[PDB]
Design a binder for this molecule. Structure first.
Ligand SMILES: CCCCCCCCCCCCCCCCCC(=O)OC[C@H](COP(=O)([O-])OCC(O)COP(=O)([O-])OC[C@@H](COC(=O)CCCCCCCCCCCCCCCCC)OC(=O)CCCCCCCCCCCCCCCCC)OC(=O)CCCCCCCCCCCCCCCCC
Ligand SMILES: CCCCCCCCCCCCCCCCCC(=O)OC[C@H](COP(=O)(O)OCCN)OC(=O)CCCCCCCCCCCCCCCCC
Ligand SMILES: CCCCCCCCCCCCCCCCCC(=O)OC[C@H](COP(=O)(O)OCCN)OC(=O)CCCCCCCCCCCCCCCCC
Ligand SMILES: CCCCCCCCCCCCCCCCCC(=O)OC[C@H](COP(=O)(O)OCCN)OC(=O)CCCCCCCCCCCCCCCCC
Ligand SMILES: CCCCCCCCCCCCCCCCCC(=O)OC[C@H](COP(=O)(O)OCCN)OC(=O)CCCCCCCCCCCCCCCCC
Ligand SMILES: CCCCCCCCCCCCCCCCCC(=O)OC[C@H](COP(=O)(O)OCCN)OC(=O)CCCCCCCCCCCCCCCCC
Ligand SMILES: CCCCCCCCCCCCCCCCCC(=O)OC[C@H](COP(=O)(O)O)OC(=O)CCCCCCCCCCCCCCCCC
Ligand SMILES: CCCCCCCCCCCCCCCCCC(=O)OC[C@H](COP(=O)(O)O)OC(=O)CCCCCCCCCCCCCCCCC
Ligand SMILES: CCCCCCCCCCCCCCCCCC(=O)OC[C@H](COP(=O)(O)O)OC(=O)CCCCCCCCCCCCCCCCC
Ligand SMILES: CCCCCCCCCCCCCCCCCC(=O)OC[C@H](COP(=O)(O)O)OC(=O)CCCCCCCCCCCCCCCCC
Ligand SMILES: CCCCCCCCCCCCCCCCCC(=O)OC[C@H](COP(=O)(O)O)OC(=O)CCCCCCCCCCCCCCCCC
Ligand SMILES: [Ca+2]
Ligand SMILES: [Ca+2]
Lengths: 95, 503, 479, 50
């Protein structure tokens, strides 16, 4: 469901972005930094994340703490609808 | 008559609030009202504080006139006096009426001038009556605000720099003391000064960074308080704020700056550093001795080099406080009694000398020594007064200046002869700069057209000096009026210091 | 949702209901002809909701499977936020009308921002934290940019939006790591799993990401650079709002997160908070010396003061939280007073913001300068002002926790910061040649200066139970 | 000379550095935020998992 919802939402949203690109198109389209240092900080940050994910293991209590355990026999969209509007009703209204 | 200390503390502040509210008009009559209202207020505070002085019982070394009420953030509002702090209250209330009377010819923003001094008095009195650790810090630091503006608004040509140096230099030293007060609050679980006087702060050595801290926690607390009181006193070499602030302040500001605010540093040593950190004080005694001996010699020679009359007096104060510091840390009855006497005595003499500078500053609007000469020819009364306090400034026997100097020197002699020998040379050096200044300003021939028509001291100016001459002579001839009050309290203080020394 | 859940969130429903109804009333019954009326009904609504939150009998609890926490801590924070928001709106009403800035939607946008803040401080779940934070953040971007003819308003919104979105992304990335480790978004579940023997790099990375994301909202260094530009660019009423209510809500949220989700790893996050507090105190103090624009000076003042507030939180104790709460309360009062004066500054009928305009103001309007003097010494933390007692409380918490090194650094930075507050006093009372700045204040704006200024001294005598109320509130959070 | 050198020589010099770093460029401010997170992550890594 979130796979299909994501496409539906961002197909329209990305098209709107195209409208603003051409509305504010720069006058130098024909010929359209500290990149070296920036790439170094990006690589460092990516390496740190990779090291943290190397040893990833959830808490041994993670299974017992699940608020909305998934059911194999229930289709994904129905499962989300059973929790989205009742357990998460406060967040639903804030959205 | 049960809240006497609260009355004398907050009465001057309340009067300032009333004056700021219900006093209108900027004409001379409006200013004339402000001067009279301030004079009646300062006179009232002095009279009420005489009830404290005469009901005070010197034999009782506990705190008297004590009042205690609940306050904010878990602190208490507690005030009281003992034989060590009662006289600093009376000195403050004594100088304030005289200081107001000396401003009678100021025409610039008079109502605001009176308010600043009335607010300043209340805060100065609170420093000496407070018996709560945080309450002491409040009055200790709140006094910077009115004085910052007194220098800024009515000061000289360098007053912007002087006012900022005065505030920030003093503020820097006291924030370290604030953290020490918070630590003592947490260890002892109280901010009650009487309770902290009996608490035993740990003195076992530990290691902090790359050095051993001899004295342990007491030394760390001692150094925080020392930074606050050393700058306030001031001690050498943290004194270079004083020659700016005292010189650039208006004459009235210089009187209160030198006569009263300097005494907060020395009183701090007698209230906190020696009673609450005795082991640390014993350890620091050698260094305090030489800093004070250096201060006497160093600033005496610096005073001799000054071309500015007010700067000679400013540097003289730093030398006189050098005796106080030595006497306190000699930690014997003779030294500590001399230190207290020296503080009170210096209040009358230093204040008077700043008033002597103002008398001729008002007429000539300059402080250069070379701009005067032979003033005795036109100003006989001034030359007599200036001479008397010049002689008191050099510690002449018969004036109150001698007694404080003599006793602090003899108390130090008992401990360190090298220090006493160096400090004792101040008698030679004080005479040098004090007499040379007097001669160059007052004696000689009247050979300048500017000084040809100079007037003598007016009756109001003469009457400001007479109380100061009286106290200087009375205490010089009968110092027992002071030592009877401070005797028993210093005896108890000296005894506790001994009983706490490591064995 | 039970009827007990609905009762718990009733103050929030009342505020949300008002915002919706106000939107329709403004749209259908006059639009900007109701702008003034909607502003003053919003002020009443904020005060009414604060009365519901703060008055009567309250029993701590939770609603919606623990996602919403109604405890003494959240009630203390909500009241200060709502009253500070009410104060900013009331004192700015005349200014915005004169400047043709009062749209009927401005009160409503502020109300929805405050609604987001109310969910922030009562968060008991990562999703509640996010949705409350984002409702506030989106409303703040809008009002930052609401002066359409000002290129500086547009740039303030742009910088705030881009950097706010970046901080929100970091917050979400850490929140995703925390959920993956614990298997739940609820804080009661999270706290039980994050303990000494099970802290992988992954979960520690999550805490850092969440902390950095939130520390942006309190302008902690080096997540602060948005503040001076946004404070300068945005409308002065909007700058006054940014300086008081969001900072209180954001500071309380950080305390909620580190104690209700990371309360068993205090040692790990206390060091990070201390390092943020140190950098914020010194940079705010040092950078403030170089400011000539009063609005931009207040940003660095804001950064330095949040550093001091973080000192109380770095303590990691009930006393540290109690004193952080009092600090934020006093800080909000001081900023209301100061920004009341800043709004009034003007030369030739146009607003003015440069510090040189204050020269010799004390001889133009004695009472206003005297109020400004008390506020500057209160911000500098000098006795006898209530601002000093705020610093005293956080320093007390630090020393109490064995962090005297932090207290020593805190007081040293205070001395550097005291210079640029002293300089304002210098300008007003014995400054240089005056250029004719006048202070235009109506009755409400005038009281927004005097009453906070009086509170700085009256508060020195009695805090009227606020210090005791903060202690009870801190206990419900820390336990 | 020392007191003035610190109060009026050094601290103003640090003030000028702080003013300079506040360049006004949005991409610099984002860089600072990224340096902060990267530095804090280095700190957490040295302490280790524990
Ligand atoms: C006048 C000079 C004074 C002098 O020579 O002191 C003798 C000094 C007195 O010390 P003591 O009590 O006999 O025993 C010291 C032991 O170090 C015992 O030491 P201690 O165990 O008691 O602990 C150390 C104690 C040791 O203290 C001392 O007594 C030694 C150092 C004291 C300071 C030296 C003089 C400082 C400058 C004087 C200028 C005055 C103007 O304290 C100090 O170290 C004090 C250091 C000074 C701090 C002040 C510096 C401020 C900035 C400059 O004795 C000697 O060093 C031997 C005699 C040498 C005489 C030479 C003088 C030249 C001829 C005239
Ligand atoms: C405490 C609570 C008591 C109530 C507050 C009192 C407020 C005083 C007041 O009425 O306002 C200022 C007063 C009104 O004057 P106004 O009519 O505006 O102008 C004509 C006269 N100048 O005008 C004045 O009197 C102004 C006086 C200004 C102060 C003089 C400047 C020197 C500094 C004085 C001492 C320090 C004051 C600060 C102390 C607090 C520190 C935070
Ligand atoms: C970091 C904060 C500063 C740490 C201070 C520790 C310095 C120290 O050693 O303290 C004691 C010091 C010198 O005393 P000392 O001569 O070591 O005592 C004799 C037995 N060793 O004691 C003193 O110097 C006394 C204080 C001097 C005041 C100037
Ligand atoms: C209390 C209610 C506010 C009344 C304020 C009186 C001010 C009088 C006034 O002029 O404005 C009232 C205004 C309607 O404007 P009015 O002037 O009647 O319009 C003229 C037609 N062009 O009225 C308004 O601006 C109304 C604003 C909306 C108030 C919402 C009330 C509901 C509160 C939320 C409860 C949620 C519970 C769930
Ligand atoms: C109509 C009523 C108006 C709204 C008033 C709400 C009252 C809230 C209140 O009193 O809350 C109490 C709460 C502590 O509650 P608790 O600890 O339970 O107290 C014991 C009770 N048995 O107390 C608290 O939470 C403390 C709240 C303190 C608020 C301080 C002010 C915050 C900043 C705003 C400053 C406004 C400046 C003035 C502006 C002038 C005009 C512009
Ligand atoms: C002129 C000379 C000036 C020299 C600096 C003056 C010293 C300033 C020291 C301030 C007081 C700090 C202190 O006493 O230590 C705080 C703390 C003790 O408290 P603690 O034992 O943790 O009790 C917890 C309560 N439950 O922790 C300790 O035990 C000691 C921690 C020391 C913190 C650093 C002190 C550095 C000194 C300042 C350097 C200059 C700036
Ligand atoms: C190196 C410094 C000291 C540390 C020593 C540890 C070495 C690991 C450092 C990690 C930094 C490198 C980044 C990669 C992270 C590896 C994660 C890992 O090993 O996990 C176990 C894990 C094993 O799988 P598991 O058995 O299912 O857990 O490794 C993998 O195989 C993960 C595969 C990653 C997929 C890459 C997808 C690329 C998309 C296209 C991009 C363009
Ligand atoms: C302007 C200054 C106003 C006066 C300062 C306070 C004088 C305190 C004398 C006691 C007043 C009283 O009866 O209230 C008791 C009241 C409560 O304690 P109780 O005596 O146990 O009822 O205490 C106070 O009023 C304490 C106030 C201290 C304020 C000092 C802060 C400024 C320095
Ligand atoms: C969206 C923001 C605007 C909100 C304004 C309207 C508030 C909701 C509508 C008004 C009536 C709600 C009364 C609830 C009754 C109740 O508690 O019993 C439930 C009741 C059963 O509870 P019982 O009485 O305990 O059995 O259920 C029902 O039959 C009604 C269910 C209505 C669900 C509406 C959910 C939306 C409310 C939450 C708003 C989110 C916060 C906004 C910030
Ligand atoms: C506190 C007092 C210290 C205040 C100064 C702190 C900055 C230290 C230096 C770090 C940045 C180096 C690169 C920029 C140097 C400035 C220059 O001359 O170039 C002009 C230059 C402007 O050139 P333009 O923008 O190309 O016109 O400045 C920059 O390029 C800005 C650099 C942005 C990226 C680094 C951001 C670092 C954020 C620092 C936040 C504060 C954390 C440290 C302080 C904590 C308190 C203790
Ligand atoms: C060495 C240890 C530290 C000693 C510090 C002693 C207190 C400061 C004495 C000098 C202050 C100078 C005041 C200048 C007044 C003036 O003219 O301003 C107007 C004027 C401003 O321009 P205007 O307002 O247009 O006249 O000042 C300047 O232009 C100079 C700016 C100087 C900035 C000073 C701020 C830093 C000093 C306070 C903090 C010290 C922290 C020490 C930390 C280390 C502790 C170990
Ligand atoms: Ca003792
Ligand atoms: Ca908790």
């Amino acid at each position: 469901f979130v796979a299909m919802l994501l496409v539906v939402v961002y197909v329209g949203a990305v098209a709107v972005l195209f409208l603003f690109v051409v509305m504010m198109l720069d006058v130098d389209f024909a010929e359209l930094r500290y990149l070296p240092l920036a790439l170094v900080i990006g690589v460092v940050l990516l390496a740190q994340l990779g090291i943290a994910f190397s040893g990833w293991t959830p808490s041994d209590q993670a299974e017992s703490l699940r608020a909305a355990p998934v059911d194999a026999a229930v289709e994904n969209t129905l499962g989300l609808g059973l929790v989205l509007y009742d357990r998460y009703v406060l967040m639903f209204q804030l959205a | 008559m049960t809240n006497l200390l609260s009355i004398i503390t907050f009465l001057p502040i309340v009067a300032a609030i009333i004056m700021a509210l219900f006093l209108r008009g900027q004409d001379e009559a409006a200013a004339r009202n402000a001067k009279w209202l301030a004079l009646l207020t300062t006179t009232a505070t002095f009279v009420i504080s005489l009830f404290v002085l005469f009901r005070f019982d010197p034999a009782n070394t506990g705190f008297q006139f004590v009042e205690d009420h609940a306050w904010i953030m878990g602190l208490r509002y507690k005030m009281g006096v003992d034989g060590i702090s009662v006289l600093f209250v009376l000195l403050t209330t004594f100088m304030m009426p005289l200081t107001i009377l000396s401003t009678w010819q100021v025409q610039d923003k008079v109502k605001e001038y009176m308010i600043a001094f009335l607010v300043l008095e209340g805060l100065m009195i609170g420093v000496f009556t407070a018996l709560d650790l945080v309450l002491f810090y409040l009055f200790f630091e709140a006094g910077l605000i009115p004085m910052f503006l007194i220098i800024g608004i009515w000061g000289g040509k360098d007053r912007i720099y002087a006012s900022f140096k005065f505030f920030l230099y003093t503020f820097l030293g006291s924030v370290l003391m604030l953290v020490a007060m918070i630590a003592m609050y947490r260890m002892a679980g109280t901010t009650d000064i009487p309770t902290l006087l009996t608490f035993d702060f740990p003195s076992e050595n530990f290691r902090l960074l790359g050095m051993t801290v001899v004295g342990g926690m007491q030394m760390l607390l001692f150094l925080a308080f020392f930074a606050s009181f050393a700058v306030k006193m001031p001690m050498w070499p943290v004194h270079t704020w004083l020659p700016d602030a005292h010189v650039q302040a208006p004459t009235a500001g210089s009187v209160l700056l030198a006569a009263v605010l300097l005494k907060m540093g020395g009183y701090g040593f007698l209230r906190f550093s020696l009673p609450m950190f005795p082991v640390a004080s014993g350890v620091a005694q050698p260094y305090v001795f030489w800093l004070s001996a250096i201060a006497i010699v160093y600033t005496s020679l610096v005073a001799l080099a000054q071309s500015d009359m007010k700067k000679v007096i400013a540097y003289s104060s730093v030398a006189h406080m050098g005796y106080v510091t030595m006497g306190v840390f000699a930690a014997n009855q003779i030294g500590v009694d001399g230190a207290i006497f020296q503080m009170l005595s210096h209040g009358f003499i230093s204040g008077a000398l700043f008033l002597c500078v103002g008398v001729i500053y008002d007429r000539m609007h300059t402080r250069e020594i070379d701009a005067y000469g032979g003033l005795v020819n036109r100003m006989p009364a001034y030359a007599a007064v200036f001479m008397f306090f010049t002689m008191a400034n050099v510690g002449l026997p018969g004036t109150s200046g001698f007694v404080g100097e003599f006793l602090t020197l003899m108390g130090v002699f008992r401990v360190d002869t090298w220090v006493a020998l160096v400090a004792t040379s101040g008698v030679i050096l004080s005479a040098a700069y004090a007499l040379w200044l007097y001669r160059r300003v007052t004696l000689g021939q009247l050979i300048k057209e500017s000084l040809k028509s100079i007037t003598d001291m007016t009756p109001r100016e003469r009457w400001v000096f007479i109380p100061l001459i009286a106290m200087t002579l009375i205490l010089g001839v009968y110092p027992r009026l002071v030592t009877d009050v401070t005797g028993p309290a210093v005896a108890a203080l000296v005894q506790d210091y001994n009983q706490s020394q490591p064995a | 949702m039970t009827s007990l859940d609905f009762s718990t969130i009733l103050p929030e429903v009342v505020l949300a209901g008002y915002a919706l109804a106000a939107l329709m009333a403004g749209a259908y019954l006059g639009k900007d002809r109701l702008a003034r009326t909607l502003l003053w009904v919003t002020v009443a609504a904020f005060l009414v909701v604060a009365a519901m939150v703060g008055l009567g009998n309250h029993v701590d609890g939770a609603a919606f499977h623990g996602m919403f926490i109604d405890d003494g801590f959240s009630r203390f924070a909500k009241v200060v936020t709502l009253v500070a928001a009410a104060g900013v709106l009331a004192m700015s009403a005349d200014y915005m009308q004169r400047r043709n800035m009062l749209r009927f939607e401005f009160p409503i946008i502020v109300a929805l921002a405050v609604l987001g803040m109310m969910f922030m401080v009562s968060a008991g779940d990562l999703l509640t934290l996010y949705m409350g934070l984002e409702l506030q953040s989106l409303a703040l971007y809008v009002v930052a940019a609401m002066r359409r003819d000002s290129v500086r308003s547009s740039e303030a919104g742009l910088k705030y939006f881009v950097l706010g979105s970046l901080s929100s992304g970091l917050l979400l990335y850490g929140a995703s790591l925390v959920y993956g480790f614990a298997g739940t978004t609820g804080f009661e579940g999270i706290i039980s799993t994050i303990e000494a023997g099970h802290l992988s790099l992954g979960v520690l990375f999550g805490l850092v990401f969440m902390l950095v994301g939130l520390s942006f909202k309190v302008s902690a260094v080096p997540f602060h650079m948005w503040t001076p530009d946004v404070y300068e660019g945005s409308p002065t009423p909007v700058t006054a709002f940014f300086a008081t209510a969001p900072k209180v809500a954001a500071m309380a949220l950080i305390a909620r997160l580190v104690f209700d989700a990371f309360g068993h790893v205090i040692g790990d996050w206390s060091q990070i908070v201390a390092a943020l507090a140190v950098m914020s105190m010194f940079l705010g103090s040092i950078a403030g010396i170089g400011q000539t624009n009063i609005k931009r000076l207040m940003a660095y003042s804001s950064i330095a003061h949040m550093g001091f507030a973080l000192v109380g939180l770095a303590a990691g104790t009930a006393i540290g939280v109690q004193n952080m709460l009092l600090y934020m309360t006093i800080y909000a009062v001081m900023n209301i007073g100061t920004f009341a004066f800043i709004l009034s500054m003007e030369r030739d009928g146009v607003p003015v913001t440069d510090l040189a305009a204050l020269n010799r103001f004390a001889w133009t309007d004695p009472v206003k300068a005297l109020a400004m003097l008390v506020l500057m010494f209160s911000l500098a933390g000098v006795p006898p002002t209530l601002g000093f007692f705020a610093k005293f409380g956080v320093l007390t918490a630090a020393v109490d926790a064995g962090m005297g090194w932090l207290a020593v650094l805190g007081v040293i930075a205070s001395v550097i910061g005291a210079f640029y507050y002293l300089r304002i006093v210098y300008y007003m009372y014995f400054g240089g040649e005056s250029e004719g700045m006048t202070s235009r204040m109506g009755a409400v704006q005038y009281l927004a200066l005097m009453v906070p200024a009086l509170a700085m001294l009256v508060g020195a005598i009695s805090m009227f139970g606020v210090d005791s109320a903060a202690g009870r509130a801190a206990e419900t959070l820390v336990g | 000379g020392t007191i003035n050198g610190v109060a009026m020589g050094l601290i103003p010099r640090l003030t000028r550095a702080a003013v300079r770093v506040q360049s006004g460029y949005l991409f610099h401010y984002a860089f600072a935020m990224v340096l902060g997170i990267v530095g804090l992550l280095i700190w957490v890594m040295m302490r280790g998992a524990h």
